Amino acid sequence: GAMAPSYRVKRMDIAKNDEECVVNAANPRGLPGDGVCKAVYKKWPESFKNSATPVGTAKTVMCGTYPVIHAVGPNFSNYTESEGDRELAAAYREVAKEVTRLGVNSVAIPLLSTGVYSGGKDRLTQSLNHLFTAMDSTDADVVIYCRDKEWEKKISEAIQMRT
Numbered sequence: 001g002a003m004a005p006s007y008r009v010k011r012m013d014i015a016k017n018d019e020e021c022v023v024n025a026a027n028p029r030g031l032p033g034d035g036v037c038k039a040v041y042k043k044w045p046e047s048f049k050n051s052a053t054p055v056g057t058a059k060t061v062m063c064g065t066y067p068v069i070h071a072v073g074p075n076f077s078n079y080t081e082s083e084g085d086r087e088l089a090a091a092y093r094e095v096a097k098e099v100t101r102l103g104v105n106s107v108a109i110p111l112l113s114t115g116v117y118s119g120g121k122d123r124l125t126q127s128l129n130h131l132f133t134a135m136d137s138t139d140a141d142v143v144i145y146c147r148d149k150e151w152e153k154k155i156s157e158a159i160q161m162r163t
């Protein structure tokens with residue numbers, strides 16, 4: 001575990017993380033995809049061997065010794081707000097199980113279902129709160145990645161509100 005388990009936020013490409021493993025915002029089919037998924041495919045293509053997994057699950061595939069945790073959030077274009085919310089919570093619970101199983105001391109995580117799976121809505125708070133619910137009981141250092149300046153400020157404020 002980390003000496004003093006913490007949350008941090010960074011505004012940068014998650015493919016350039018400084019953590020011991022990465023969470024991919026994957027599609028259920030293990031395709032190169034778009035956004036975070038495409039950056040992860042370019043950096044760790046070997047990790048897409050048999051990476052297909054259902055919505056609300058996470059599947060880890062090694063790239064060398066570096067673990068890529070493929071976490072499949074719901075596409076809110078297809079799911080109801082209610083069913084989507086349950087699958088988004090479930091994906092993060094499966095990420096916490098994988099991070100714990102791997103024994104890493106740090107993990108790089110994106111906000112699942114906030115990009116092309118958002119159904120055209122702002123889901124910063126919804127996604128972040130499900131991330132906290134899952135990861136609060138883990139002792140890895142969690143570094144949350146984002147691309148927008150206003151998202152960085154809102155994520156940083158949410159972390160500080162708890163400390």
Ligand SMILES: Cc1cn[nH]c1-c1ccncc1
Pocket residue numbers: 012013014015035036039110111115145146147
């Ligand atoms: C689209 C992309 C590529 N590398 N990282 C991201 C990213 C990270 C966090 N939040 C949104 C996007």
Ligand SMILES: Nc1nnc2ccccn12
Pocket residue numbers: 111114115145146147148151
């Ligand atoms: N996850 C994330 N980071 N920055 C942004 C901006 C818009 C939508 C989602 N975002």
Ligand SMILES: [Cl-]
Pocket residue numbers: 011012013016
């Ligand atoms: Cl960057």
Ligand SMILES: [Cl-]
Pocket residue numbers: 025112113114115116117118
């Ligand atoms: Cl997304």
